[PDB]
Amino acid sequence: RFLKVKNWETDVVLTDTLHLKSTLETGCTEHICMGSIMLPTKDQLFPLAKEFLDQYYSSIKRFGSKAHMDRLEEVNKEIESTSTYQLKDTELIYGAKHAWRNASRCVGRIQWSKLQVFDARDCTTAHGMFNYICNHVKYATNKGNLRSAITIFPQRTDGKHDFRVWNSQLIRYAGYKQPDGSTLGDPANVQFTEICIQQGWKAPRGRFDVLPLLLQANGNDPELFQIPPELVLEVPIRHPKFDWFKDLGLKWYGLPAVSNMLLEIGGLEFSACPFSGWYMGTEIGVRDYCDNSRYNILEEVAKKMDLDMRKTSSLWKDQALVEINIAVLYSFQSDKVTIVDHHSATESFIKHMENEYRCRGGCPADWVWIVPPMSGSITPVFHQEMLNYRLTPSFEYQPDPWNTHVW
Amino acid sequence: RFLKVKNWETDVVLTDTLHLKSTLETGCTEHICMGSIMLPVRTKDQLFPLAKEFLDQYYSSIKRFGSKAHMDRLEEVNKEIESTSTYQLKDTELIYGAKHAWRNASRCVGRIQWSKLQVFDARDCTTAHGMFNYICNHVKYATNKGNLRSAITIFPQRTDGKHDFRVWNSQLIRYAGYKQPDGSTLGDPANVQFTEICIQQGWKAPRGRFDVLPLLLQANGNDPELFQIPPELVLEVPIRHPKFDWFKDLGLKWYGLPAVSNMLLEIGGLEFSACPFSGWYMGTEIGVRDYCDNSRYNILEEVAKKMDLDMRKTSSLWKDQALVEINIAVLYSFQSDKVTIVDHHSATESFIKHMENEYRCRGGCPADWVWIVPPMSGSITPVFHQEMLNYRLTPSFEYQPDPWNTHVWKG
Ligand code: HEM
Numbered sequence: 021r022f023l024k025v026k027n028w029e030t031d032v033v034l035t036d037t038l039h040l041k042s043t044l045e046t047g048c049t050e051h052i053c054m055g056s057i058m059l060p061t062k063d064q065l066f067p068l069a070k071e072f073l074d075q076y077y078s079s080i081k082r083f084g085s086k087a088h089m090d091r092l093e094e095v096n097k098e099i100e101s102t103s104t105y106q107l108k109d110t111e112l113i114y115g116a117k118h119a120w121r122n123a124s125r126c127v128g129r130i131q132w133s134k135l136q137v138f139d140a141r142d143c144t145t146a147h148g149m150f151n152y153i154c155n156h157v158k159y160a161t162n163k164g165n166l167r168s169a170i171t172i173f174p175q176r177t178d179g180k181h182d183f184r185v186w187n188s189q190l191i192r193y194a195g196y197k198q199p200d201g202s203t204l205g206d207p208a209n210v211q212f213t214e215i216c217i218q219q220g221w222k223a224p225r226g227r228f229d230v231l232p233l234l235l236q237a238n239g240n241d242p243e244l245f246q247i248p249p250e251l252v253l254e255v256p257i258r259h260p261k262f263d264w265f266k267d268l269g270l271k272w273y274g275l276p277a278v279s280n281m282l283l284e285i286g287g288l289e290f291s292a293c294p295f296s297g298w299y300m301g302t303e304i305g306v307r308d309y310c311d312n313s314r315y316n317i318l319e320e321v322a323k324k325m326d327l328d329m330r331k332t333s334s335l336w337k338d339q340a341l342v343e344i345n346i347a348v349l350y351s352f353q354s355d356k357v358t359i360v361d362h363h364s365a366t367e368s369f370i371k372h373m374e375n376e377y378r379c380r381g382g383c384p385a386d387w388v389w390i391v392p393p394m395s396g397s398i399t400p401v402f403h404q405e406m407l408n409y410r411l412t413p414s415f416e417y418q419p420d421p422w423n424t425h426v427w
Numbered sequence: 428r429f430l431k432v433k434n435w436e437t438d439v440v441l442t443d444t445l446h447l448k449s450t451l452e453t454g455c456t457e458h459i460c461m462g463s464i465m466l467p468v469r470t471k472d473q474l475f476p477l478a479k480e481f482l483d484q485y486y487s488s489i490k491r492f493g494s495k496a497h498m499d500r501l502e503e504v505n506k507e508i509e510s511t512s513t514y515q516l517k518d519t520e521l522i523y524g525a526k527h528a529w530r531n532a533s534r535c536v537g538r539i540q541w542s543k544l545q546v547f548d549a550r551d552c553t554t555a556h557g558m559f560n561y562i563c564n565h566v567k568y569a570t571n572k573g574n575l576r577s578a579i580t581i582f583p584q585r586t587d588g589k590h591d592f593r594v595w596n597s598q599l600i601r602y603a604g605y606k607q608p609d610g611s612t613l614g615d616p617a618n619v620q621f622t623e624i625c626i627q628q629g630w631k632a633p634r635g636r637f638d639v640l641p642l643l644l645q646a647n648g649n650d651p652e653l654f655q656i657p658p659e660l661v662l663e664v665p666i667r668h669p670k671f672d673w674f675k676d677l678g679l680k681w682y683g684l685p686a687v688s689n690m691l692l693e694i695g696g697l698e699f700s701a702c703p704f705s706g707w708y709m710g711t712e713i714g715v716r717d718y719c720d721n722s723r724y725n726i727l728e729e730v731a732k733k734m735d736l737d738m739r740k741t742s743s744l745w746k747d748q749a750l751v752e753i754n755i756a757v758l759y760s761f762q763s764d765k766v767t768i769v770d771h772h773s774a775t776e777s778f779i780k781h782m783e784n785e786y787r788c789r790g791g792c793p794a795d796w797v798w799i800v801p802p803m804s805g806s807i808t809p810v811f812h813q814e815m816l817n818y819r820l821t822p823s824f825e826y827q828p829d830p831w832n833t834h835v836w837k838g
Pocket residue numbers: 120123125126127128129131135168169170278295296297298299300303360365415
């Protein structure tokens with residue numbers, strides 16, 4: 021019942037009682053752990069709303085108050101009559117902040133309470149979505165001094181009028197399969213870069229073409245829009261020593277902004293809820309740049325450094341990796357764009373965990389995702405035991421729209 | 428039931444059916460995952476079923492399931508259990524058992540080598556002095572002048588729980604740790620408590636930074652006894668860097684034989700409490716953990732200084748830079764002295780081939796992702812991108828309480 025987690029580097033032990041409120045399943049059983057798998061009605065709704073409202077009222081120290089009771093009945097009546105309900109602005113803000121607070125795979129949750137929420141529940145068209153999104157991008161980019169934000173479009177009704185942002189992230193580079201059998205640009209977006217053409221986009225066929233938003237409103241077919249170039253802050257990457265680095269012709273966008281998840285608050289589902297914060301260096305330097313199935317640039321950087329790539333044990337990949345990540349952090353920092361390194365981010369998360377353990381009784385966390393993709397054990401989270409479990413409000417995964425949309 | 432795992436770097440998907448033979452618990456539930464938690468005398472009653480499951484696997488393995496040989500053996504063991512409350516394994520069954528505990532060790536990345544294991548049968552051993560001799564022979568054989576060979580030595584199984592054989596050392600070869608009155612530590616901080624037990628037991632500590640600890644051996648439930656491993660038998664490697672001539676002056680060196688001695692080997696319900704095993708090192712065990720963990724040798728700073736990196740702010744990634752160099756130094760030193768060692772790229776690439784092979788020929792390969800991915804350069808090794816299923820199969824290697832916490836001293 022009362023579990024404990026120990027940090028093997030500092031011997032600190034914390035007791036976990038928050039998991040006892042867990043609702044959703046984990047995919048694991050007492051017989052098999054699936055910790056490393058990426059993706060493991062009115063009657064149904066009122067209980068969910070109640071769970072939510074109770075925690076909301078408790079958070080504002082009015083648990084059991086008349087207001088609490090009053091609200092509880094009002095929603096109940098609305099569900100019984102409308103088969104759904106609308107959240108109060110306050111409940112919306114609280115819900116969004118808590119879905120972030122509950123995101124077990126996010127290392128930057130110490131920032132959870134500082135989130136700007138844009139209520140786009142009055143939106144009705146794709147052009148309106150485009151308008152709300154540009155405003156979001158501009159707000160969060162803030163000339164390089166990034167601010168976390170989320171824009172929340174209308175909740176699901178009958179499933180046949182869902183709002184969706186077809187892009188996986190608001191800002192990403194296109195990818196095209198060339199005759200050479202090779203891939204141009206970002207390989208992960210090949211299929212998306214094509215659906216933009218299948219729709220009309222005029223691909224400049226470059227190695228870093230900011231893709232076009234493909235917005236779907238109220239259920240209709242998605243429409244294209246080109247984010248005002250002046251709104252997309254990008255950073256050219258140079259090394260603070262290797263002058264040849266720039267010649268690689270590398271750059272990355274400054275706004276990390278996930279747009280394909282589903283936000284669940286009190287039983288309600290928000291299928292279009294783009295959110296953004298600021299980067300941790302490794303996401304770009306290690307994953308976007310060095311992943312084999314991504315820009316896969318290790319060999320090139322290695323050759324440029326004249327390293328013995330004959331034998332794996334000279335660790336040329338490792339040496340290069342470090343430089344490629346020193347570069348990213350260097351550039352961003354030079355151009356004054358917010359960014360955090362894995363050492364600082366993980367240290368933060370540990371502080372946050374301790375706070376969450378003493379003020380909430382726990383902090384759900386997925387070790388597989390929390391530990392950086394490079395230098396694992398020299399970051400504190402590596403030695404930190406973590407308990408993973410699901411709490412609502414939450415951000416959930418949902419099917420790519422192009423595999424569900426009936427045109 | 429069928430389960431699938433996917434590799435996100437190659438899109439390759441695999442199907443697991445082996446998990447259906449999993450019996451032990453994982454620590455997880457449908458409500459909480461304990462995937463990153465380090466540590467989540469039998470009765471006749473519970474023993475024959477364990478014996479039967481094991482003998483069925485053995486007899487199937489040799490394609491003699493249901494044979495007369497198979498049925499007689501089951502009848503033999505059954506009778507032995509009702510009669511003596513336990514039973515003895517044939518030599519062939521012990522070997523098969525040991526090899527399989529390694530094959531089922533989901534936290535082991537070097538399992539492609541599982542069928543090549545030299546098993547030393549020390550079940551006729553009765554005293555600590557006898558244990559020492561057995562252990563010396565294992566160290567000499569395994570080391571093989573630098574051309575390492577995997578091996579395991581198996582001492583008498585548990586009986587009433589009051590006569591256990593135990594190797595008090597966590598690893599056969601490790602360096603002493605000494606807490607100074609100023610609060611600093613000389614040597615390996617992880618072995619400070621064990622070193623104190625050794626000193627208290629009579630060990631004359633040379634108090635340096637790399638003193639090979641003495642073996643503390645317990646036979647038949649009696650009080651443990653100290654022994655010094657013949658120095659000539661302890662292979663060591665001086666650590667130097669291929670380009671940094673000052674690295675050698677850091678005064679670092681490491682032993683060549685990695686060898687776990689505190690685990691419990693379970694085969695057919697029987698418990699082998701003293702079962703030291705050894706293989707050869709993956710560079711990062713020494714380069715990343717033993718040297719760079721903050722609670723171990725912690726050499727990141729001193730190495731950093733010498734290289735004159737910008738240590739003012741973490742974003743220079745000075746820690747990461749000194750980490751690669753040190754790991755380069757460990758691999759180089761071992762290769763130069765012709766002592767077997769494998770880097771993390773090579774080891775993980777092999778594990779992936781091993782794993783696929785295992786799904787095809789066995790229907791699975793239980794693996795613990797948290798332990799399989801190297802402690803540095805995680806995502807540039809193929810295992811990072813590999814989904815894994817973790818479940819427990821027997822025969823297996825299990826944790827057991829440290830003996831100083833359970834032993835009834837006799838004086
Ligand atoms: C302000 C700085 C922030 C930092 C430094 C940060 C960092 C991280 C990192 C490193 C990841 C893993 C990315 C990957 O490997 O794909 C992540 C994932 C995630 N973050 Fe944060 N984050 C921040 C802000 C946000 C915000 C504003 C929200 C929510 C409103 C959020 C929600 C999540 C979720 C749900 C995931 C997992 C997404 C998935 O499963 O693919 N993050 N975060």
